[PDB]
Amino acid sequence: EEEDAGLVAEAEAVAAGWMLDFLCLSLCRAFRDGRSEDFRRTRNSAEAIIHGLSSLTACQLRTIYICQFLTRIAAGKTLDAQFENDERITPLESALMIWGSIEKEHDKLHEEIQNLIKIQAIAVCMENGNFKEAEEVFERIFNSHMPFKSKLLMIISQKDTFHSFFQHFSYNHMMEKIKSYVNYVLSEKSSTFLMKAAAKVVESKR
Amino acid sequence: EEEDAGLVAEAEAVAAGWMLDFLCLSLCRAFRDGRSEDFRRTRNSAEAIIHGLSSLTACQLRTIYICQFLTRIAAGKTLDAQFENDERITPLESALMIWGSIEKEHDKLHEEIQNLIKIQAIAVCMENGNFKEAEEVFERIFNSHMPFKSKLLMIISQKDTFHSFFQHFSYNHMMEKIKSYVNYVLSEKSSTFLMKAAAKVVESKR
Ligand SMILES: CCOc1ccc(S(=O)(=O)O)c2ccccc12
Numbered sequence: 023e024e025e026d027a028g029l030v031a032e033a034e035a036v037a038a039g040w041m042l043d044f045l046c047l048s049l050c051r052a053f054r055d056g057r058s059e060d061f062r063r064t065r066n067s068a069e070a071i072i073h074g075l076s077s078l079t080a081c082q083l084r085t086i087y088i089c090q091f092l093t094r095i096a097a098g099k100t101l102d103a104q105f106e107n108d109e110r111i112t113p114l115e116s117a118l119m120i121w122g123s124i125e126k127e128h129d130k131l132h133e134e135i136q137n138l139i140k141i142q143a144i145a146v147c148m149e150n151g152n153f154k155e156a157e158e159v160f161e162r163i164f165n166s167h168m169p170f171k172s173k174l175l176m177i178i179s180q181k182d183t184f185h186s187f188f189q190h191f192s193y194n195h196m197m198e199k200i201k202s203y204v205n206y207v208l209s210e211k212s213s214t215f216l217m218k219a220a221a222k223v224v225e226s227k228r
Numbered sequence: 229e230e231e232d233a234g235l236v237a238e239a240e241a242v243a244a245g246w247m248l249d250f251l252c253l254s255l256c257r258a259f260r261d262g263r264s265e266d267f268r269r270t271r272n273s274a275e276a277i278i279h280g281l282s283s284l285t286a287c288q289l290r291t292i293y294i295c296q297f298l299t300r301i302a303a304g305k306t307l308d309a310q311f312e313n314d315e316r317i318t319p320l321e322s323a324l325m326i327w328g329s330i331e332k333e334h335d336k337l338h339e340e341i342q343n344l345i346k347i348q349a350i351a352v353c354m355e356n357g358n359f360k361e362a363e364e365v366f367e368r369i370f371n372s373h374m375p376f377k378s379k380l381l382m383i384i385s386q387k388d389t390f391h392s393f394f395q396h397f398s399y400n401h402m403m404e405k406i407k408s409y410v411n412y413v414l415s416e417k418s419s420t421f422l423m424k425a426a427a428k429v430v431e432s433k434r
Pocket residue numbers: 065068069072073086089090091093094105
């Protein structure tokens with residue numbers, strides 16, 4: 023009857039919840055491994071499942087945020103990507119905003135990732151010859167470490183796209199620090215229902 | 229190590245297999261219920277999961293075919309949709325081709341659905357004033373019941389878009405016969421892992 027349709031819709035929301043956790047775990051692994059194409063396909067799958075979910079728990083929203091964060095980080099050098107309704111916000115600025123919104127511990131790693139994203143948000147503009155855009159990214163991002171802030175401005179003004187500072191704080195560094203965080207998310211999600219049940223099936227055939 | 233990555237990829241294929249069965253079941257229910265928007269969102273989810281699957285069992289391929297069939301049937305009046313690399317194949321012709329490919333029993337219902345799709349493949353062209361396209365659909369579809377074939381041609385030639393024959397064999401009739409088939413697919417898939425586990429969770433909270 024009508025209650026059977028409600029029970030079906032509830033079961034659908036439970037399965038969508040399990041699918042979201044599995045797809046996050048898969049997306050995190052793909053990011054960690056540098057499996058570009060798998061990340062792209064899993065991102066499409068995760069977005070599709072999320073559009074079929076109406077009520078989100080606090081943990082599911084954090085999970086969605088992490089997926090959006092890693093997507094924006096991966097698209098960090100793609101200045102043609104628009105991740106926000108405001109067309110001016112670059113992908114690394116968008117990632118920084120989500121990083122500042124996640125309900126997570128503000129540990130040392132957190133601040134290192136944050137500072138690395140800020141530096142690289144400017145650097146990727148410099149590297150594309152977008153000098154006026156680097157200044158605008160700078161003003162939106164920056165209260166903050168004055169010495170740090172000043173150095174960047176100098177570099178922007180000097181228009182030295184290839185400056186040594188960005189080597190000490192390279193995109194790679196930003197990626198490796200983010201991958202260490204992804205490793206901790208993976209430990210927490212490797213125990214979710216779908217992955218756990220799929221792993222037991224694989225282990226029973228060995 | 230490298231075998232852990234292989235075990236992870238295997239577990240991913242197992243979970244993708246379970247997700248495909250659940251999404252088919254969800255798509256079938258949405259079609260049966262006339263839940264247009266849910267069908268659209270679930271279709272996006274099912275397509276995304278399928279792009280992340282490499283090895284398909286015979287049963288998974290039949291499942292994919294049913295999803296593609298119901299999608300083309302739902303888009304039957306959308307003559308702007310191109311479902312095949314050949315731009316001339318209308319959605320109902322595309323659905324008819326998949327219907328002729330499914331590894332399923334050729335029972336009475338099967339042939340009724342098939343004949344109803346053939347009639348409606350012509351009717352939806354007539355209804356749009358696409359008289360030359362109805363003739364071309366006719367020649368591609370039609371060996372076949374000569375009386376049946378002849379009547380259609382007469383109607384096409386008479387250009388009577390609104391002809392009584394199509395009432396006796398309406399799009400609705402085609403939809404209701406297809407919904408009876410969907411009801412049998414639902415019984416077969418309501419027992420799959422994801423739906424079964426999600427239903428037990430919902431039932432334990434009652
Ligand atoms: C609410 C739908 O979900 C998403 C929307 C947008 C993006 S993004 O624009 O590509 O960042 C996602 C990226 C990953 C996972 C889910 C996403």
